[PDB]
């Protein structure tokens, strides 16, 4: 049930693995199966299976040889630790601070205002959009976005129109807007637990009644010596 290494990632060329494999080393027990099988069948009764020569037969359209798949190396985060209260410096929620809930497999952030205070939804935003401020909300109470995954907020649906299948349709479905009930319920539970932790800290720019206010680096104030 195992045997591993390669601490090459620190070094960066090197060992542990070669050396230990040698200590362990067999000199005995080299016997193997591993069954291949095709299913290229002329199974003929009359059932007669084939396939023949479909075509890769020269309708010479020169089409660009597919550049295959770079590695899924796990997106090493900056010390944006969930729940750091951080600034969305960009895109409609421009200069509203929000609390981090999670890291997802897409690389990018889960952000909630809390919703009820600073009007920011269960909303996902780039690691780069964000200045990660020193202020920390206790992220232990949460249902966690184990339940909110890439797929969950993926849109149910931008059909090009009225569900079904080719009904010669009409201008305007709901590309951004109904809203969905499943998504409301998800917010309200998470936000409620946010509000309990967030109320412990005193009013001003950005935790509870602190949350509402819309950011001020006021005239004569400094984005560079703000050690956010």
């Amino acid at each position: 049930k195992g045997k591993k290494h390669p601490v090459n990632s620190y070094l960066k060329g090197g060992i542990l693995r070669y050396s230990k494999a040698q200590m362990y080393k067999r000199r005995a027990l080299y016997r193997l199966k591993d069954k291949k099988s095709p299913v290229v069948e002329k199974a003929k009764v009359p059932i007669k299976k084939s396939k023949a020569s479909y075509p890769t037969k020269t309708f010479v359209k020169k089409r660009p040889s597919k550049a295959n798949f770079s590695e899924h190396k796990r997106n090493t985060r900056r010390n944006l630790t969930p729940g750091t209260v951080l600034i969305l410096l960009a895109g409609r929620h421009q200069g509203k601070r929000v609390v981090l809930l999670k890291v997802l497999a897409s690389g990018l952030l889960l952000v909630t205002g809390p919703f009820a205070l600073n009007s920011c939804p269960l909303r996902r935003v780039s690691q780069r959009y964000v200045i990660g401020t020193s202020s920390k909300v206790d992220l232990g109470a949460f249902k966690v976005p184990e339940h909110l995954n890439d797929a969950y907020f993926r849109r149910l649906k931008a059909k090009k129109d009225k569900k079904t299948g080719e009904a010669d349709i009409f201008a305007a479905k709901k590309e951004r807007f109904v809203p969905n009930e499943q998504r409301k319920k998800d917010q309200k539970e998470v936000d409620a637990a946010l509000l309990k932790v967030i109320k412990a800290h005193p009013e001003g720019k950005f935790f509870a009644k602190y949350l509402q206010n819309m950011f001020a680096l006021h005239s004569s104030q400094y984005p560079h010596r703000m050690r956010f």
Partner: protein
């Protein structure tokens, strides 16, 4: 007196059938068994005895008229149709294509015959397509 070496070298620039339109390096072959309009060495009349020609149909679309090569025997002296041999086929492409691989003991061409096959589809098809319509 005939070589598949000399006959291109003779004709390289001085071919009536090789018409050069604009700059454009090389090439254009009209030479009646080109298969690729190229004009290279082997996309041509002799060569010797390896020359597929495809002509549709006349009255669309019974026939992609295949002309079967004819080595060595006849010299390929005029002509009794000898460098060619008129197998008028029918029906469904993929068969004619696999069927061509078998007669290709002479595999030199293989793509060329297929370029003519696939291209002749576009020539034969526009009367029952060239739409859309669902």
């Amino acid at each position: 007196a005939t070589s598949s070496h000399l006959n291109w070298l003779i004709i390289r620039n001085n071919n009536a059938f090789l018409l050069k339109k604009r700059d454009v390096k090389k090439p254009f072959s009209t030479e009646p068994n080109n298969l690729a309009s190229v004009s290279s060495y082997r996309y041509s009349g002799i060569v010797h005895k390896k020359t597929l020609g495809v002509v549709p149909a006349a009255d669309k679309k019974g026939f992609t008229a295949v002309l079967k090569k004819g080595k060595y025997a006849q010299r390929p002296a005029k002509n009794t149709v000898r460098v060619d041999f008129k197998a008028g086929p029918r029906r469904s492409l993929k068969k004619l294509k696999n069927l061509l691989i078998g007669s290709k003991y002479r595999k030199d061409l293989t793509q060329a015959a297929l370029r003519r096959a696939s291209a002749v589809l576009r020539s034969q098809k526009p009367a029952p397509v060239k739409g859309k319509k669902a």
